Design an enzyme around this catalytic site. Structure first.
Site, PDB file in Angstrom:
ATOM      1  N   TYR B  51       0.843  -1.208   0.000  1.00 21.32           N
ATOM      2  CA  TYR B  51       0.000   0.000   0.000  1.00 21.32           C
ATOM      3  C   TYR B  51       0.873   1.250   0.000  1.00 21.32           C
ATOM      4  CZ  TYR B  51      -5.067  -0.334  -0.251  1.00 21.32           C
ATOM      5  OH  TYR B  51      -6.353  -0.447  -0.714  1.00 21.32           O
ATOM      6  N   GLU B  53      -0.561   4.758  -0.887  1.00 21.07           N
ATOM      7  CA  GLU B  53      -1.360   5.966  -1.111  1.00 21.07           C
ATOM      8  C   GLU B  53      -0.501   7.195  -0.865  1.00 21.07           C
ATOM      9  OE1 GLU B  53      -4.806   5.751   1.421  1.00 21.07           O
ATOM     10  OE2 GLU B  53      -5.883   4.499  -0.010  1.00 21.07           O
ATOM     11  N   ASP B 197      -5.046  13.779 -25.536  1.00 20.41           N
ATOM     12  CA  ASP B 197      -5.017  12.360 -25.203  1.00 20.41           C
ATOM     13  C   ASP B 197      -4.196  11.641 -26.272  1.00 20.41           C
ATOM     14  OD1 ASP B 197      -5.465   9.658 -24.683  1.00 20.41           O
ATOM     15  OD2 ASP B 197      -7.640   9.863 -24.496  1.00 20.41           O
ATOM     16  N   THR B 223      -2.204   6.249 -22.353  1.00 20.34           N
ATOM     17  CA  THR B 223      -2.016   4.908 -21.833  1.00 20.34           C
ATOM     18  C   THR B 223      -0.533   4.563 -21.968  1.00 20.34           C
ATOM     19  OG1 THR B 223      -2.585   4.023 -24.005  1.00 20.34           O
ATOM     20  CG2 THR B 223      -4.349   4.131 -22.348  1.00 20.34           C
ATOM     21  N   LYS B 226      -0.043   1.063 -25.579  1.00 22.83           N
ATOM     22  CA  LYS B 226      -0.248   1.029 -27.031  1.00 22.83           C
ATOM     23  C   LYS B 226       1.107   1.137 -27.760  1.00 22.83           C
ATOM     24  CE  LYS B 226      -5.089   2.672 -26.658  1.00 22.83           C
ATOM     25  NZ  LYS B 226      -5.046   2.814 -25.183  1.00 22.83           N
ATOM     26  N   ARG B 232      -0.228  -2.381 -19.037  1.00 26.91           N
ATOM     27  CA  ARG B 232      -1.546  -1.774 -19.143  1.00 26.91           C
ATOM     28  C   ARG B 232      -1.775  -0.765 -18.006  1.00 26.91           C
ATOM     29  NH1 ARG B 232      -5.520  -2.972 -22.691  1.00 26.91           N
ATOM     30  NH2 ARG B 232      -4.105  -4.582 -23.509  1.00 26.91           N
TER      31      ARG B 232
END
Lengths: 405, 405
Positions: B51, B53, B197, B223, B226, B232
């Site tokens: 974790y 955060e 984008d 992303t 690609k 991913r």
């Protein structure tokens, strides 16, 4: 690893540091755990290469025959584990699982009733700096100031006064069993949907050690990575009547391509949870938490609610005149990892706090038992009673190292 | 794999099917690629257990020293790759990257101007069944009906009429270079933020083969999976003036715990993209796309915009009296994976379409060159000119198998 060490020395060195750290420290962060090598292998698979928007047999890309098998394995095993009519295993996280349920049944500005964030409620249950509190009108119910148990009459009064469209039950820092029957009764009285966020307790629910919210809730959200001991991600369970709407909320609603490799890892984790030995593990988690609670009380510590029914506990440090921040810091110095945590009716800010949150899921996974719980409690006592003594802290350090071998 | 085969035969069998499928087929889905073994190893690491955060040096959990090193490696390499003042490498996906930017600068119901979804715009650029179109008031600019190039006078008129708070440039199915300078000029005229984008073209941008939106856009989303050929996930780039706000939008705004193992994989992918051989790869992608375009035209096919400047092309199947759905189906029968795709001013629904979308990133990664592009075009011609001939389809099947070895 074979290829990473050669390709990226910098990333590999950091990962190796992290791996050694995970072995050396006593990990008491209540939300953490250690996944199996099988789970990791699934996450490290070629499934990352596949776009699979949509659902099994209903995808928007060809060539999904095999990732479909994987996703259905995840969904069916989840339904077996929890007795749910429908599962969606695509949510990228607990955040996104909750986001999708909200997207399904609420409009912008709708009233939602959730657990007070200073009493155990999660960020995504209405924080004004989170999408939940910004997008919807959140009101809160509290725990009793003495017992620290959810005040169900307060849940009821808040519901009757504010007339929420949705009631949220479940918590990131609540050490007692939640009465889902009572939540549904209240929801029924005011004509609200009931969502249960079981993220913390999901493994315990799977093992029959906490009541199952599935029969009482319209929607159940969860992470796959806490007591369920799976990969990092989310999941939604619901009755068949909401299946179509929930699936549409995840895609095309709030996400795009799912992480098929993580979904494979989810399937693996669910497979593990279905085994008898996971049930034995989960009992040891709860047994260890009770033992740790009792042992801390023996050391002179006050616990929120006076103990625990689950995997986690909160120490109220006010009797020791310590803040959670101070305790977190000094425990870090000796190799014990905890969180500072707001206690119910905490006089300190959430950035300082009067408490620490502790959970046993991780240490149980590494094979710690009752004797180790006693020793962890003794070390915590040694540290927090002697914050100014470097010799005490060095002794603690040595006792921590003895536990982790 | 060592542990998965023993632990979960069902999941392992499906993964192995998927692995063999990825080798056997000719993968022409424009958004797909094949990641390195190093990238996968990073995703398959113990970092899933942590974790974290918050951000490096500013986390809400102890013990993040090493995952901090990993995240900073990702951020710094991204800044090196794209020349951005700030990177956020935490977004779980392209969806969440876009979601966070919207959360940063827009209020519910604000007007946003994006590319027409039937002309190449993405789902998250205003679809009425996506959060973007539900949460904000999206209006669209179009491409010219003859040239299929973005009509910049239409971008300008729509902006001046509708007065958007935000303009979005970039696409999931636009085969030509986007003029980011003109987008910024229009944004400046109407006092709108500009978001680009670059998900599809990110690898090309990194290799200097497409103009970089970073100097012209307030926010750049992408992303990592690609043309960038990473794991991913998503990423946001922005100027320093928006860094704090963007980071807060991701957390505590729209996400919780980041996927530290995926972030490690992002770092690895960025490291690879920084190498000279990635630049050579990306040129081959673009070279291969042009060659495939020319070869398809030689076969008698009409292409949207008359060719391509990037990794992708769209075939307008109207001259052959075929739908995209029919073409997608029959190509699937012979082992060629494409998407049906709406063409500009398509007379068919988005569920039928008059086109197919093809990209060369994946086949280039596996080492295909110009000769292979010619053969792929020839096989597509053979198939689409002979949809009713099982013998032609069997010949195609054999020629596909010959290419994949």
């Amino acid at each position: 690893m074979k290829y990473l060490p050669q390709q990226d020395p910098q990333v590999f060195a950091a990962i190796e540091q992290e791996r050694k750290r995970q072995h050396a420290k006593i990990e008491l962060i209540a939300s953490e755990n250690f996944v199996s090598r099988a789970v990791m292998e699934a996450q490290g698979s070629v499934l990352t290469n596949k776009y699979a928007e949509g659902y099994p047999g209903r995808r928007y890309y060809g060539g999904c025959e095999y990732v479909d098998i994987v996703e259905e394995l995840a969904r069916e095993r989840a339904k077996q584990l929890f007795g749910a009519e429908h599962a969606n295993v695509q949510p990228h996280s607990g955040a996104q699982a909750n986001m999708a349920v909200y997207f399904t049944v609420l409009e912008h500005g709708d009233t939602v009733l959730g657990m007070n964030l200073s009493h155990g409620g999660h960020l995504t249950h209405g924080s004004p700096v989170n999408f939940s509190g910004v997008q919807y009108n959140f009101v809160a119910y509290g725990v009793d100031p003495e017992t620290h148990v959810i005040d169900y009459d307060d849940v009821r009064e808040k519901a009757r006064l504010h007339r929420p469209k949705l009631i949220v039950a479940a918590a990131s820092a609540y050490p007692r069993i939640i009465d889902f029957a009572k939540f549904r009764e209240i929801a029924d009285e005011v004509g609200a949907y009931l969502m249960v966020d079981m993220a913390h307790i999901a493994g315990l629910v799977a093992a029959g050690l906490h009541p199952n919210p599935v029969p009482y809730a319209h929607f159940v959200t969860t992470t796959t990575h806490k007591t369920l001991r799976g990969p990092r991600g989310g999941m939604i369970l619901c009755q068949e009547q909401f299946a179509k709407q929930i699936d549409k909320a995840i895609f095309p609603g709030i996400q795009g391509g799912p992480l098929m490799h993580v979904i494979a890892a989810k399937a693996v984790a669910f497979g593990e949870a279905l085994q008898d030995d996971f049930k034995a593990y989960a009992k040891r988690v709860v047994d260890n938490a009770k033992r740790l609670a009792s042992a801390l009380q023996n050391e002179g510590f006050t616990l929120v609610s006076g103990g625990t029914d689950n995997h986690l506990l909160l120490v109220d440090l006010r009797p020791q005149q310590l803040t959670g921040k101070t305790a977190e810091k000094v425990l870090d110095e000796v190799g014990i990892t905890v969180n500072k945590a707001t206690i119910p009716y905490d006089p300190e800010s959430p950035f300082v706090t009067s408490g620490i949150r502790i959970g046993t899921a991780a240490v149980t996974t590494r094979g710690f038992g009752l004797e180790e719980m006693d020793e962890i409690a003794a070390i915590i006592g040694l540290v927090l009673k002697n914050v100014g003594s470097e010799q005490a802290l060095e002794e603690a350090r040595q006792r921590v190292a003895a536990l982790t071998d």
